[PDB]
Amino acid sequence: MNAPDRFELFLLGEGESKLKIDPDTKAPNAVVITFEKEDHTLGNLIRAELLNDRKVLFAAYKVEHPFFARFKLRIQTTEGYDPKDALKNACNSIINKLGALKTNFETEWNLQTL
Amino acid sequence: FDMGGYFIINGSEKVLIAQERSAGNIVQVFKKAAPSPISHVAEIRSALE
Amino acid sequence: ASRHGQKGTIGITYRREDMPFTAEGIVPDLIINPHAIPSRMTVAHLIECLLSKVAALSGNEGDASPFTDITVEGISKLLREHGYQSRGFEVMYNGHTGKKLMAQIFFGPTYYQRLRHMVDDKIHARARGPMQVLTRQPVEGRSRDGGLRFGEMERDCMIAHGAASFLKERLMEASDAFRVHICGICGLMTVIAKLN
Amino acid sequence: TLSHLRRTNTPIAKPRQLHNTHWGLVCPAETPEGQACGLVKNL
Amino acid sequence: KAIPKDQRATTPYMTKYERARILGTRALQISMNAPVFVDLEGETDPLRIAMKELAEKKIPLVIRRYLPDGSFEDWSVEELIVD
Amino acid sequence: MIVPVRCFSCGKVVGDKWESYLNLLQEDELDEGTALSRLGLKRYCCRRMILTHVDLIEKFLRYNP
Amino acid sequence: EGLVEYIDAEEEESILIAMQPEDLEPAEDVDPAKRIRVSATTFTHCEIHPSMILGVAASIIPFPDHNQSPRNTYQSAMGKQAMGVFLTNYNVRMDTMANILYYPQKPLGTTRAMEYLKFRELPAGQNAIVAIACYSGY
Amino acid sequence: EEGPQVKIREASKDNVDFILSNVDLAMANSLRRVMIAEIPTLAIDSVEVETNTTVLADEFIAHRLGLIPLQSMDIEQLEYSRDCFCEDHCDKCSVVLTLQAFGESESTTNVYSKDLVIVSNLMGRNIGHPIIQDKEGNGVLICKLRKGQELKLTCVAKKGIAKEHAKWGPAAAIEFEYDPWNKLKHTDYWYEQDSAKEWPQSKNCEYEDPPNEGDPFDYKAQADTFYMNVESVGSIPVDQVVVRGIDTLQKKVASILLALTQM
Amino acid sequence: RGNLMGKRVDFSARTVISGDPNLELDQVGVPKSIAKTLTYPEVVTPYNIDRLTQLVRNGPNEHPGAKYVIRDSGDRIDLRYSKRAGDIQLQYGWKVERHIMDNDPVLFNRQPSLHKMSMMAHRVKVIPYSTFRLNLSVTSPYNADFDGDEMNLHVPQSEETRAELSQLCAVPLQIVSPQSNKPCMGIVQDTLCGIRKLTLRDTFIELDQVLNMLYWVPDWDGVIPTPAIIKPKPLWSGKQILSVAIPNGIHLQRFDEGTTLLSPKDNGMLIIDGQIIFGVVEKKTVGSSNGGLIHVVTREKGPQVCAKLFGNIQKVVNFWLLHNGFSTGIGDTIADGPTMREITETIAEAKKKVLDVTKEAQANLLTAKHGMTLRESFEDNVVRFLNEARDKAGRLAEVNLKDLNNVKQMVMAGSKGSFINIAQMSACVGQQSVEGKRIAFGFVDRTLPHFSKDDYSPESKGFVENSYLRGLTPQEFFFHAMGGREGLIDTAVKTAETGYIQRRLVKALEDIMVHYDNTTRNSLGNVIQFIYGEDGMDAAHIEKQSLDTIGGSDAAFEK
Amino acid sequence: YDRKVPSPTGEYVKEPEWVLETDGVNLSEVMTVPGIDPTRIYTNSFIDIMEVLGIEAGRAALYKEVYNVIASDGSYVNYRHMALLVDVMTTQGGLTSVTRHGFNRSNTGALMRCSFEETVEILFEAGASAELDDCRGVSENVILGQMAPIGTGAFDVMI
Amino acid sequence: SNTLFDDIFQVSEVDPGRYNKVCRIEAASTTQDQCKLTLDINVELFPVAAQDSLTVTIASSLTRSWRPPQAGDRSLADDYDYVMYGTAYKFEEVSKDLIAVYYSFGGLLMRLEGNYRNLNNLKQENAYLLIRR
Amino acid sequence: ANWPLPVNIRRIIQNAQQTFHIDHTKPSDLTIKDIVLGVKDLQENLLVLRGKNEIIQNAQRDAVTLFCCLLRSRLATRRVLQEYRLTKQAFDWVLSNIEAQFLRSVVHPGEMVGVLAAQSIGEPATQMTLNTFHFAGVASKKVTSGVPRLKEILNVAKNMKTPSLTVY
RNA sequence: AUCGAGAGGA
Ligand SMILES: O=c1ccn([C@@H]2O[C@H](COP(=O)(O)OP(=O)(O)OP(=O)(O)O)[C@@H](O)[C@H]2O)c(=O)[nH]1
Ligand SMILES: [Mg+2]
Ligand SMILES: [Mg+2]
Ligand SMILES: [Zn+2]
Ligand SMILES: [Zn+2]
């Protein structure tokens, strides 16, 4: 009766973005980026791949409320080097390792019987 | 599975809950603080079968 | 509730992913706080969950029979020859992070009861509406979409905060605010009010 | 259904008690909590 | 009968009950478009506006505190120390 | 109340294994432990969705209408 | 055949009863984890088996002897608000309100007394997977 | 190869057990959590009951049908109902089914999924064949009929993911374990007398070394080497199950970079 | 008594309550469909019309919608109904009865209302799902578990009435107790067991989690503090990152019985300026105790400060516990082998030393003490004699619980449970009693048919030598029940006595209010007290202060 | 018994003293006794302690007794309250019961007295004895449905 | 912003008291009779046996929130292994002169006694601890 | 020694000795006239009641009295210049701030205590039975000795339960 | 809807 519809987990609504951008009001060269319609499959893999980059001062996320599936990401970087670029450049590192798994899996799968 | 016992009345089932009571025809001895006139009472409830 | 006076309602539902899982990938149906455990004493709930496991592995229906020769150290010798650890525990991974949970969890099968009383059958709200004729007070219970009683004991807590206009309100503009005509001498409701 | 059919109501020194002669005739724990507790007992 | 301008031995402090009420009586006035005095710094809650109107003691209304025997003691929100 | 499709905990198909259950339990005679195992049920989450099940439809079927 | 008498509370007064109809009768090394039992040699008649001090709702409880008794009572007042299958017949029975579990299951631990309470045939809950743990704090 | 090193040891039609070398954990856990939910499947989603004379109430049966296994390999070349342009459902978005069995026999008339009928044009692609694993060939008991009971049906099966209802999960059960011997010491053991005689030795100990007695704790060593076994319901054979994980993962790992290029 | 001092009222809701760790203390988890229904008469000002015409359009469905619009002449305009519901021109000075927005004042109570603290104003966060949702640390003054306790909500209609809630009844204002002069709300359960787990000197966290925790506290100044450790691997201490919630300007000194300014056993509690030196935070500090942090931070600016604090502590302990975990097994009630041997002989002597004092009155002489007379008598003598056979074993089974034992944790923290809770669970449940005396003789001169008449020994009047782990024996069992039963007795009945006791106390004292001259009076003008509490001083603002002019030497005084 | 006593040297050292415990009350004649301290003597009977020692002794006895009930095994109420209670009982002259008999007579407003235990018969005599009602109490204006002189109700607001 | 103390010490007792990680260490000073030391050392991270001698340099440098490394390589260690940052609090006394400090590395405490006094021991917030070999 | 007393000096003491953190081992700057003719003047203007007539001014003192005895005992010159070593500026603060903490700890005229004088009182008793239980034994006290002893108290109990006499 | 009965939840 008050249960919210099941699809409100990936179906983005009207006048809603899949990324939001505001800087942190306190620490400079730092941004809080608001992902929408997403859980810590994207909240987790993104932070722990923001850590390999030494050019990145800060990296964290929080599931704000189990009720609305949306996490916020806080990032702080080295003077002059954009945070938006920090993310952009970190995402492709994932992709690359992922498109690595596709190949490596099938190469080994094909060699198995049954 | 219905093992029954209920009386079917007006189209709903009714059940009889065992009523309780102090047994009859037994002589019992009662006190009964004294202030108060009396101090001791022998009592028997009495009814036929 | 379970079979042991273990009443407590759902507090959330986490999909199989956000759910803590096991070394084999067993998802729990059911998560209670280990805080409604000692309070509270109910050591049986524990043992039920310890026996019911073995039974689900060995195939054999377990004997949870009351005054009998069955021991925690008798189940433990069996759950130990079944590839789990003797007192029910299991190593678990946090679903949000796939990081091991630093403390082992107590995990297994406990027969659970669904009692009546579901929010959607209790949930009630009224803001104005149908009232009686005797008192012009809101009618009783959700069945005739009525209010709630602001009883004596309630009245007490209010004076306690000294909320003074709040006790004009919750006893005038939310119950009765009838309006009559008093006589300046013979202070009684008899005056004929020919209006407007 | 079972446990309603074998119910025992008592009208009105120490009545709500579980007493020694209750042993294995009335149920030691089967009783309606609050209201009229200890009065009504099941067999 | 009325106690004069002097001889004032109440608490010279705004009782929380005077507070809630004076805030309340004004929070009515604000909510029903009646003149607003302080520079409304882009706030629109008739509750929070009075909260500023009490910071800058600009509220016209005088609490008349009564004493058991009857005869009373005045004091205005401008005279009273908010705390 | 009719063996469930799959099992709430894991999710593995269980519906197809009730049929072979009775047959393994009764036709050539074995104990339950071996039953769930040859049926392929190794996880007890899923072992329980059969052992604990009672097929009430059976006695619903005994009715004329 | 003179093997079992009927005893009410009045006659019960002048009798001796053994528990545990074996315990408690034979002639006179031991497991430490097992429970602690006390011990007259002038018995009149034996108790059949302890559990039969319980009623219906109680005899539904696994190990009520390991359970703080006030709770055993709570469990009983709640056993009657359980959800299951009251009769096979319902799907033509016209009675105000009725609840039926989508997919019931027998329990896994079972008090012997269930067999006569036909419980393993008309259950009231599900043998779900239980995780006693702190997590979200919900 | 380049990064992640995947070594398979045991695999079949329904069970793929493998290692997964040289990855940080945040991938491993994101992987399964896409393998669970975010992979799409087809399964019943609009049932229209024409006639039911079974003891089983109407939406109860309807429910069970959702859960029933459905072939979904060519599922990618099927649009979503939301993302399709027709009205309710079409043949480029929804595979429609039908179910008919009638009590003609005195002695128990079983319904199965084998008794499901493909009604819509299949476009000739491989999609919407109810899965049979049954030794005999009768995939899963749907229902039971008696002497004179009918069940007349019309199913619409749609695309969907395990976030929207656990029927759409080509999931099953995901086995997960890193670090059998606690060398990383992410977890501290509950013991009574000893740990090694009170906790079991894990299947995953052959091909992972014993840490030795007098070797001081390794502080900075990280999460490498995870031991997984992925089970299939059957809608997607095991190989594709895992691939599509990676895929959908990347697919939405991309869908942000793209929407970032939108700002 | 039922229709003038206990009226039926409009604008009210009722539901099951559930826990939310991510709500804030002064908040209330109103379910959507209630807030679809509960109105608040608001007049239209040039301030609000922008939000308000936009509301009418949203209708009695879209959450921030509204029903009814009241006009000038007094005509009522239904909004689900009517044919002009899709527009309407808003004039100045019209009522626009509206749903409830987020952050509105509402009185949220629970029966039995046995306080003032049972009735508190709250902030409104309209939530999906149908449960009333609340802060885990606003549990204690209401008295409310989520086993399905049903709670209640009321909504003001004047703006003055509003103020009256948020300015008096507002949850934060009621944090410190004007009844027990100590803060009634505190960190409770998961947050309370884990805070302990966090602050263990032993407990470390690092980067990957550290950083996330900083992002958790909302008031974070974007300043990572410097990790107490920068050796081979940079760690933070559990204590460390906790300080981030501890606001800058707060100070705490404790000293327990074993506390050296070293705290070898990490005892006591030293906090400096919102940073933690040493100790382990538990119910004495983070708990609703007297000298506890919550008391401190509420008297040192301010209430709401303290209020936000609460919510922060949780959020971080919650996030830590989440990933570290905790449960409780049967193993946690298991006692070491050669120690439940040392308990059975601890009964075995305490029993055999009742057998001494039993053969005495059987002797008979006796030396039967002066009063202590008797019969009172030897029937008091055995009562302690086993109440000591229990409470010795209860301690013998505390030393066994090594620091991993999941139960002790919840006692070391005091989350829930204690000594007697441990004792009954591992040693023996003890001598049960009825009306203060060990089980009374029902049958003539005997307790049961399984005993012989006349047996004043323990296994015979209601003593249970076994634990709950071992399972009681029938004999024992039955008695325990009889006992238990007496508890569920006063639950419905003896409660009445006390509840009635109040209904008088309340009705008697009542209009005794401190008048405008600090002289406590009734309705007549009769003084009752000349300066309230004989010092004209509010309880809420008082603390356990130590007059160190009394104690000490005449010479320790001089120097 | 044990008793903290000022030692001539300065510190408080424990002075263990024989004290006597008695089932019985006859204060009147017991304190007159040769040998016992008639400054420290104390029966739990606060009813007789009142008739013997005047009203002010009673005041402190009734308190001490409520205390010994509430604040025994840990429990704590801040003086003010117990005190306040104690006081209300004490001032009318003797000991006034916290029941219908006592304070429900004490010349107070009628309607307020109507809202307790005896009900009708209270209004009956109110109608009989021609009683005038103050209208100053809590319950008076609750029944009449008004902002009663309570907390936010003490003062009226002007300009 | 200069190195502050340093002294050679020797372990007299290692007491694993209700803790697996982080021990307590009792140490007597080398050369300087008038001096004793008690400190909490993370034994898991840095093994300490009985009768092992150490190296204990203090210093106060080698708002600004905490960066990670970025190596650079902003100096300080390599030849100092065990490091901890903390805060000073109450200062002691027992002869006159001497005199003793209390340190708090986020819970892991320290007690050092001995009369050099110092005066290049400030009352201040800063406080490191560097331990090599 | 330990008693309910308003305004925590003990803390305003640690609030002084870390705000302006002196700290040592470096000597103060308040003359004996600053400390002493300070406390004894604060003692004038703490105020519980106000007036101007004799009776009020004496019932005033006879209410502060206790507080002062503590104030006097912790703001004493030896202490103020040995254990705590305050400065002119910091003491003038401890001076202003106690006064400030004090006239906040006033009972507000308005306060309805009669009610609050229950239920407090009627609460624990109610909830310290009604609890009710937990669990088994003994369990009172409390409660059984007890709450029916309480009943006695409020009734004017002529037929006393247990009449016990205690002689010294 | 009114009066009356019972059962159950905290
Ligand atoms: O007859 C009753 C019984 C109980 N109550 C109220 O409900 C509560 C009953 O107890 P709770 O259910 O609140 O907690 P508990 O731990 O005492 O019991 P369980 O959760 O195990 O069931 C009591 O604390 C009291 O506030 C009543 O108002 N009346
Ligand atoms: Mg509860
Ligand atoms: Mg409850
Ligand atoms: Zn399963
Ligand atoms: Zn379509």
Q: What is the DSSP string of E22-68?
A: HHHHHHHHHHTT----S---S---TTHHHHHHHHTT----EEEEEET
Tell me the two tokens of residue F59. 């006695």
Whole-number Cα distances in Å, I456 to G24, I371, I445, I512, J135: 21, 21, 10, 54, 64
- Contact between K1 and K60 (Cβ < 8 Å): yes
Q: Which contacts of J148-151 are long-range, i.e. CB under 8 A and separated by 24 or more positions? A: J148/C164, J148/C167, J150/C159, J150/C162, J150/C163, J150/C164, J150/C167, J150/I513, J150/L110, J150/L112, J151/C159, J151/C161, J151/C162, J151/C163, J151/C164, J151/E17, J151/I168, J151/I513, J151/L110, J151/L111, J151/L112
DSSP SS3 for I354: helix
- The H or E element spanning position I304 is helix I303-324
DSSP SS3 for H97: strand
DSSP SS3 for I332: helix
Tell me the two tokens of residue L105. 């700890």
- Contact between H6 and H18 (Cβ < 8 Å): yes
- Atom of ligand 1 lying closest to residue I491 CA: 1
Q: I145 in ligand 1 pocket by Cβ < 6 Å?
A: yes
Burial I76-93 (b: 16+ CB within 10 A, else e): ebebeeeeebeebebeee
Closest CA to I95 of I38, I56, I153: I56
Is A3 near chain C, with CB under 8 Å? no
Burial class (CB within 10 angstroms; exposed 0-12, middle 13-18, buried 19+) of I217: buried
Q: At what angle do helices I494-509 and I474-490 cross, to 10 degrees?
A: 20
Neighbours of H31 (CB within 10 A): 26
Among C24, C26, C91, beta carbon nearest to H187: C91
- Contact between H247 and A102 (Cβ < 8 Å): yes
Among E9, E12, E15, beta carbon nearest to L108: E15
Burial class (CB within 10 angstroms; exposed 0-12, middle 13-18, buried 19+) of I163: buried
Q: Do B2 and G87 touch (CB under 8 A)?
A: yes
- State the amino acid at position E65 in one-letter form: R
Q: Which residues pair with K26 in a beta bridge?
A: K13, K38
The CATH code of the domain at E1-83 is 3.90.940.10
Q: C7 in ligand 1 pocket by Cβ < 6 Å?
A: yes
Q: Tokens 């909500």, residue?
A: I153
Whole-number Cα distances in Å, I352 to G36, I327, I358, I437: 16, 40, 10, 21
Q: Which residues pair with B41 in a beta bridge?
A: B30
Nucleotide of closest approach to B17 (CA, C1') = M6
Closest CA to I207 of A60, F35, H107: A60
Q: Residues L153, L156, L159, L163: what is their CA dihedral angle, to the nearest 10 degrees?
A: 50
Is C84 near chain G, with CB under 8 Å? no
Q: I112 in ligand 1 pocket by Cβ < 6 Å?
A: yes
Instruction: Work out the end-to-end distance of chain B between its first and last CA atoms, rounded to an integer number of angstroms.
Output: 37
**Shortest distance, CA C141 to any CA of chain J (angstroms):** 24
Closest CA to C171 of E21, J148, J149, I111: J148
The CATH architecture assigned to I11-37+101-174 reads Beta Barrel (2.40)
| CATH class of the domain defined by I328-473 | mainly alpha
| CATH class of the domain defined by K1-133 | mainly beta
| CATH class of the domain defined by A1-114 | alpha beta
The number of helix segments (H) and strand segments (E) in chain L equals 8, 2
Cα distance between residue C174 and residue I157, in whole Å: 9
**Closest-CA residue in chain K for A76?**
K67
- Contact between G60 and G111 (Cβ < 8 Å): yes
Domain spanning I38-100: CATH superfamily = RNA polymerase ii (3.30.1490.180)
Consult the annotation and say whether F45 binds a ligand: yes
H136: left (phi over 0), alpha (psi -120 to 50) or beta: alpha
Question: Which domain CATH number covers H237?
Answer: 3.30.1360.10
Cα distance between residue I224 and residue I243, in whole Å: 12
- Check if CATH label 1.25.40.10 holds for domain F1-65: no
Q: Tokens 């899923």, residue?
A: F46
- State the amino acid at position J125 in one-letter form: E
Cα distance between residue I470 and residue I493, in whole Å: 34
Whole-number Cα distances in Å, I353 to H7, I171, I271, I399: 70, 56, 51, 25
Q: Which residues pair with H160 in a beta bridge?
A: H41
Closest CA to I492 of L146, L133, C4: L133
Residues H180 and H259 in one domain: yes
DSSP class of residue I427 equals T
Closest CA to B32 of B24, B41, B23: B41
CA C22 to chain centroid? 28
Q: How do D7-9 and B18-19 pair as beta strands? A: parallel
Domain ranges of chain K: 1-133
What value, to the nearest 5°, has the Cα angle with vertex J146 and ends J140 and J148? Answer: 60
- Contact between C20 and C62 (Cβ < 8 Å): no
Q: Which residues contact E67 (CB under 8 A, 6 or more apart)?
A: E73, I515, I516, I517
Cα distance between residue C39 and residue L135, in whole Å: 9
Q: Do H6 and A91 touch (CB under 8 A)?
A: no
- Determine the protein residue whose CA lies at the shortest distance from the C1' of M1: C132
What value, to the nearest 5°, has the Cα angle with vertex E58 and ends E56 and E60? Answer: 155
- Contact between I226 and K43 (Cβ < 8 Å): no
Q: Which residues pair with L165 in a beta bridge?
A: J22, J43
What value, to the nearest 5°, has the Cα angle with vertex I263 and ends I260 and I269? Answer: 100
Calculate how far, in angstroms, residue H232's C-alpha sits from the geometric centre of ligand 5. 28
- Contact between I190 and G134 (Cβ < 8 Å): yes
Q: How do I269-272 and I235-237 pair as beta strands? A: unpaired
Burial L135-158 (b: 16+ CB within 10 A, else e): bbbbbbebbbebbebbbbbbbbbe
Q: Which residues contact L155 (CB under 8 A, 6 or more apart)?
A: J97, J98, J99
Tell me the two tokens of residue I450. 């399984």
Calculate how far, in angstroms, residue H83's C-alpha sits from the geometric centre of ligand 5. 8
CA H86 to chain centroid? 29
- Contact between J148 and C164 (Cβ < 8 Å): yes
Q: Which residues contact I134 (CB under 8 A, 6 or more apart)?
A: I17, I19, I20, I23, I27, I28, I29, I108, I151
Residues H57 and H135 in one domain: yes
Tell me the two tokens of residue C53. 């496991």
Residues H20 and H125 in one domain: no
Is D32 near chain G, with CB under 8 Å? yes
Q: Residues I381, I382, I386, I389: what is their CA dihedral angle, to the nearest 10 degrees?
A: 70
Tell me the two tokens of residue G21. 């109809």
Tell me the two tokens of residue I284. 């004495």
DSSP class of residue H70 equals B
Cα distance between residue E16 and residue I168, in whole Å: 8
Burial class (CB within 10 angstroms; exposed 0-12, middle 13-18, buried 19+) of I489: buried
Q: Which residues contact E45 (CB under 8 A, 6 or more apart)?
A: none
What is the full DSSP assignment across B1-49?
------EEETTEEE---EE----SS-EEEE---SSSS---EEEE-----
Judge whether residue C144 contacts strand M, using its CB and a 7 Å cut-off: yes
Tell me the two tokens of residue I440. 């009374």
Domain ranges of chain E: 1-83
DSSP class of residue F27 equals I
Q: How do C148-150 and I132-134 pair as beta strands? A: unpaired
Q: How do C105-109 and I7-9 pair as beta strands? A: unpaired
DSSP SS3 for I558: helix
Residues H235 and H144 in one domain: no
Phi, psi of K56 (to 5 degrees): -125, 85
Q: Tokens 């003054």, residue?
A: I141
Instruction: Work out the end-to-end distance of chain H between its first and last CA atoms, rounded to an integer number of angstroms.
Output: 36
Tell me the two tokens of residue A37. 């319609």
Consult the annotation and say whether C49 binds a ligand: no
DSSP SS3 for I333: coil
CA I210 to chain centroid? 30
Tell me the two tokens of residue C124. 């009630």
- Contact between J159 and C188 (Cβ < 8 Å): no
Tell me the two tokens of residue J74. 């840990």
CA–C1' I149–M9 (A): 8
Among L110, L119, L135, beta carbon nearest to C162: L110
Whole-number Cα distances in Å, B7 to B15, B20, L53: 6, 20, 86
Neighbours of L81 (CB within 10 A): 15
Phi, psi of K112 (to 5 degrees): -120, 135
Closest CA to H166 of F4, G125, A63: F4
Closest CA to L109 of A100, C188, I519, I111: I519
Tell me the two tokens of residue G126. 């599900």
Domain spanning I175-327: CATH superfamily = RNA polymerase Rpb1, domain 3 (1.10.274.100)
Cα distance between residue G90 and residue C171, in whole Å: 48
Whole-number Cα distances in Å, C190 to C2, C82, I357, I399, J34: 64, 89, 83, 82, 76
C9: left (phi over 0), alpha (psi -120 to 50) or beta: beta
- Contact between C145 and C129 (Cβ < 8 Å): yes
Tell me the two tokens of residue I244. 């981030």
DSSP SS3 for C57: helix
| E strands in I175-274 | 204-206, 235-237, 269-272
Cα distance between residue J139 and residue J110, in whole Å: 10
- Contact between L130 and I495 (Cβ < 8 Å): yes
Tell me the two tokens of residue I401. 């619980």
Cα distance between residue G24 and residue G18, in whole Å: 6
Closest CA to A4 of E27, I35, I130: I130
Q: Could you tell me the residue range of the domain that residue H248 belongs to?
A: 2-40+167-263
Neighbours of H120 (CB within 10 A): 17
Q: Tokens 């493998």, residue?
A: H18
- The H or E element spanning position I420 is helix I419-426
CA I396 to chain centroid? 29
Cα distance between residue J97 and residue J110, in whole Å: 18
I524: left (phi over 0), alpha (psi -120 to 50) or beta: alpha
Neighbours of C124 (CB within 10 A): 19
Domain ranges of chain A: 1-114
CA–C1' G62–M8 (A): 24
Cα distance between residue I204 and residue G135, in whole Å: 19
Neighbours of L97 (CB within 10 A): 15
Whole-number Cα distances in Å, H127 to C161, H7, H246, I496, L6: 68, 31, 22, 69, 79
Whole-number Cα distances in Å, E55 to C137, E82, I165, I170, K124: 42, 8, 20, 20, 39
